[PDB]
Write a protein that holds these residues in place. Sequence first.
Motif, mmCIF file in Angstrom:
data_model
loop_
_atom_site.group_PDB
_atom_site.id
_atom_site.type_symbol
_atom_site.label_atom_id
_atom_site.label_comp_id
_atom_site.label_asym_id
_atom_site.label_seq_id
_atom_site.Cartn_x
_atom_site.Cartn_y
_atom_site.Cartn_z
ATOM 1 N N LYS A 86 49.110 -33.602 129.846
ATOM 2 C CA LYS A 86 50.370 -34.365 129.743
ATOM 3 C C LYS A 86 51.396 -33.567 128.954
ATOM 4 O O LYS A 86 52.602 -33.617 129.276
ATOM 5 C CB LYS A 86 50.163 -35.754 129.123
ATOM 6 C CG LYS A 86 51.381 -36.676 129.231
ATOM 7 C CD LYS A 86 51.969 -36.736 130.651
ATOM 8 C CE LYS A 86 52.935 -37.900 130.865
ATOM 9 N NZ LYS A 86 54.081 -37.966 129.934
ATOM 10 N N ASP B 101 54.995 -32.514 130.358
ATOM 11 C CA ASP B 101 56.173 -32.956 129.591
ATOM 12 C C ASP B 101 57.059 -31.765 129.207
ATOM 13 O O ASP B 101 58.257 -31.933 128.950
ATOM 14 C CB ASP B 101 55.788 -33.705 128.316
ATOM 15 C CG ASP B 101 55.316 -35.144 128.562
ATOM 16 O OD1 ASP B 101 55.348 -35.633 129.724
ATOM 17 O OD2 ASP B 101 54.911 -35.782 127.538
ATOM 18 N N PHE C 111 57.814 -29.661 133.392
ATOM 19 C CA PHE C 111 58.691 -30.406 134.287
ATOM 20 C C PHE C 111 60.078 -30.599 133.647
ATOM 21 O O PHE C 111 61.094 -30.354 134.290
ATOM 22 C CB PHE C 111 58.089 -31.769 134.685
ATOM 23 C CG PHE C 111 56.868 -31.707 135.604
ATOM 24 C CD1 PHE C 111 56.064 -30.585 135.734
ATOM 25 C CD2 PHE C 111 56.464 -32.869 136.237
ATOM 26 C CE1 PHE C 111 54.926 -30.588 136.533
ATOM 27 C CE2 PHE C 111 55.347 -32.890 137.060
ATOM 28 C CZ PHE C 111 54.547 -31.746 137.196
ATOM 29 N N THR C 112 60.107 -31.036 132.392
ATOM 30 C CA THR C 112 61.362 -31.250 131.680
ATOM 31 C C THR C 112 62.190 -29.963 131.610
ATOM 32 O O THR C 112 63.378 -29.971 131.896
ATOM 33 C CB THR C 112 61.072 -31.721 130.251
ATOM 34 O OG1 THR C 112 60.273 -32.908 130.289
ATOM 35 C CG2 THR C 112 62.366 -31.992 129.462
ATOM 36 N N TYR D 71 63.737 -29.870 139.462
ATOM 37 C CA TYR D 71 64.390 -31.120 139.844
ATOM 38 C C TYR D 71 65.827 -31.048 139.354
ATOM 39 O O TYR D 71 66.130 -30.320 138.400
ATOM 40 C CB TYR D 71 63.664 -32.343 139.261
ATOM 41 C CG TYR D 71 64.037 -32.641 137.826
ATOM 42 C CD1 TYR D 71 63.480 -31.931 136.749
ATOM 43 C CD2 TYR D 71 64.966 -33.631 137.551
ATOM 44 C CE1 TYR D 71 63.861 -32.218 135.439
ATOM 45 C CE2 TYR D 71 65.347 -33.919 136.266
ATOM 46 C CZ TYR D 71 64.808 -33.213 135.216
ATOM 47 O OH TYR D 71 65.238 -33.548 133.944
ATOM 48 N N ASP E 284 67.500 -37.813 138.941
ATOM 49 C CA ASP E 284 66.654 -38.876 139.483
ATOM 50 C C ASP E 284 67.066 -39.243 140.912
ATOM 51 O O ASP E 284 66.474 -40.126 141.533
ATOM 52 C CB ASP E 284 66.632 -40.114 138.563
ATOM 53 C CG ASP E 284 67.974 -40.804 138.445
ATOM 54 O OD1 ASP E 284 68.890 -40.537 139.240
ATOM 55 O OD2 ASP E 284 68.097 -41.643 137.536
ATOM 56 N N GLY F 6 64.080 -41.132 142.240
ATOM 57 C CA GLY F 6 62.983 -40.246 142.637
ATOM 58 C C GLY F 6 63.288 -39.283 143.780
ATOM 59 O O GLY F 6 62.410 -38.515 144.198
ATOM 60 N N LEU G 215 48.424 -43.051 139.910
ATOM 61 C CA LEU G 215 49.784 -43.290 140.372
ATOM 62 C C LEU G 215 50.878 -42.596 139.532
ATOM 63 O O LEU G 215 51.704 -41.872 140.085
ATOM 64 C CB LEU G 215 50.084 -44.784 140.488
ATOM 65 C CG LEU G 215 51.503 -45.116 140.968
ATOM 66 C CD1 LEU G 215 51.733 -44.557 142.362
ATOM 67 C CD2 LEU G 215 51.758 -46.610 140.932
ATOM 68 N N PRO G 216 50.869 -42.777 138.212
ATOM 69 C CA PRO G 216 51.976 -42.151 137.467
ATOM 70 C C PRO G 216 51.952 -40.622 137.551
ATOM 71 O O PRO G 216 53.007 -39.999 137.556
ATOM 72 C CB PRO G 216 51.782 -42.666 136.043
ATOM 73 C CG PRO G 216 50.341 -43.064 135.982
ATOM 74 C CD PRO G 216 50.029 -43.615 137.334
ATOM 75 N N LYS H 147 53.359 -39.692 140.866
ATOM 76 C CA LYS H 147 54.805 -39.909 140.913
ATOM 77 C C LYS H 147 55.583 -38.870 140.098
ATOM 78 O O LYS H 147 56.692 -38.518 140.482
ATOM 79 C CB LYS H 147 55.156 -41.342 140.531
ATOM 80 C CG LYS H 147 54.685 -42.400 141.537
ATOM 81 C CD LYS H 147 55.386 -42.255 142.873
ATOM 82 C CE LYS H 147 54.713 -43.047 143.986
ATOM 83 N NZ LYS H 147 55.417 -42.751 145.275
ATOM 84 N N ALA H 148 54.993 -38.355 139.014
ATOM 85 C CA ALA H 148 55.676 -37.301 138.238
ATOM 86 C C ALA H 148 55.873 -36.072 139.130
ATOM 87 O O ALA H 148 56.960 -35.461 139.177
ATOM 88 C CB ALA H 148 54.882 -36.955 136.995
ATOM 89 N N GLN I 49 55.859 -36.087 142.518
ATOM 90 C CA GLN I 49 56.716 -36.475 143.654
ATOM 91 C C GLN I 49 58.203 -36.535 143.265
ATOM 92 O O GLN I 49 59.078 -36.315 144.112
ATOM 93 C CB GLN I 49 56.227 -37.797 144.225
ATOM 94 C CG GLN I 49 54.877 -37.660 144.913
ATOM 95 C CD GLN I 49 54.317 -38.979 145.376
ATOM 96 O OE1 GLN I 49 55.066 -39.936 145.640
ATOM 97 N NE2 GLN I 49 52.991 -39.040 145.508
ATOM 98 N N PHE I 50 58.476 -36.787 141.984
ATOM 99 C CA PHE I 50 59.858 -36.835 141.460
ATOM 100 C C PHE I 50 60.504 -35.460 141.629
ATOM 101 O O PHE I 50 61.719 -35.360 141.826
ATOM 102 C CB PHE I 50 59.838 -37.280 140.006
ATOM 103 C CG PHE I 50 61.189 -37.510 139.386
ATOM 104 C CD1 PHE I 50 61.900 -36.463 138.808
ATOM 105 C CD2 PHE I 50 61.718 -38.809 139.298
ATOM 106 C CE1 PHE I 50 63.124 -36.695 138.199
ATOM 107 C CE2 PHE I 50 62.932 -39.034 138.679
ATOM 108 C CZ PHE I 50 63.623 -37.989 138.107
ATOM 109 N N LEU I 51 59.674 -34.415 141.576
ATOM 110 C CA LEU I 51 60.120 -33.022 141.773
ATOM 111 C C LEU I 51 60.353 -32.697 143.243
ATOM 112 O O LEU I 51 60.955 -31.670 143.554
ATOM 113 C CB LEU I 51 59.083 -32.036 141.227
ATOM 114 C CG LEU I 51 58.650 -32.220 139.784
ATOM 115 C CD1 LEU I 51 57.646 -31.155 139.401
ATOM 116 C CD2 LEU I 51 59.832 -32.229 138.821
#
Lengths: 192, 192
Positions: free
Chosen positions: A80, A84, A87-88, A95, A98, A107, A147-148, A151-152, A154-156
């Motif tokens: 994590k 964090d 990705f950030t 990305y 949003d 997303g 799931l989360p 989704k992290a 998939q947000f990318l």
Amino acid sequence: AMSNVLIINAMKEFAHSKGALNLTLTNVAADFLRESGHQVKITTVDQGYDIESEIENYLWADTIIYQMPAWWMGEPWILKKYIDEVFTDGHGRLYQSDGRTATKGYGSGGLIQGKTYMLSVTWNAPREAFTDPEQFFHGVGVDGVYLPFHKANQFLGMKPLPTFMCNDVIKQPDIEGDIARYRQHLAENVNS
Amino acid sequence: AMSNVLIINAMKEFAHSKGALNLTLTNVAADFLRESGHQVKITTVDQGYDIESEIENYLWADTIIYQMPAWWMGEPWILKKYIDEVFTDGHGRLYQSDGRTATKGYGSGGLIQGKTYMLSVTWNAPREAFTDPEQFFHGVGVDGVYLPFHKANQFLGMKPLPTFMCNDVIKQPDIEGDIARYRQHLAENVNS
């Protein structure tokens, strides 16, 4: 010219760690993918990492494989922390936003559409805990539990490949079977 | 003699942090609960902690409140580290086993049945992203997104109280409204 693959080995040493299944599976995937024509890079999270180098690894990779033990129902904290940071700190490259421009579209602001990712997880829970509607996870499946994390990614903009899971790894170990199964999974899901 | 409450403030400083909503809500809950007769302890995760003291805080508390910003769809890594340490290192006191004695029973080996926990989360995502079946989370709701975090707590034997969520906290801030709403939520869910 097969795809570039980044394998992220999120193994974490634990006082009561029975073996080294995550290291084994990381290397099984690396060998399998190299034998089948892919260029492969491996990140070993517990060794530390240069955040920018890891972002560049994502940009280079066509597929990301997360090899990880389940800790308290999900990824170990070290992974994590990795996401964090990576990705950030990849804002503008992994990305953009949003995806909104205010109630719809969340997303859809990723930048790495076209790349795929896959979860390879090791659990002591029995497979039935995930599928039997009367058990702990009420039948949502391994992908519902993750799931989360899904989704992290998939947000990318990435899309998932089917998840590989080893179950009852402490109470009913089966290393040779896991290896054989995992090679079949990689053939079916990464090389198709 | 109202219940003992442990508030875990998982605020995490970020280069682009717009404010201090998690600190504000942590203190709003502490004030509200003290005014209503509870003994309250606050753990500020980003300050560090003594793992054993935190396990003892859980044993003392009747209700645990997790006040946290959403980072990449879930808890900040500092809070996953906290639970990976606290829950694991509470073996024999917070949980005994996975509850099996081999395909059924997973998750029934906790030891702190009777205690309750509640999530209080801050998100920039709009509420619709969680409820509209055609949006990012495909209608599973905030509790579906936090499924693994819920299940980590339930493995210990605890039961949840309804989740409190603040949405669009960056693009549509509303501190006074959040505070007023949160007090009503605490009255309805912790004091009932």
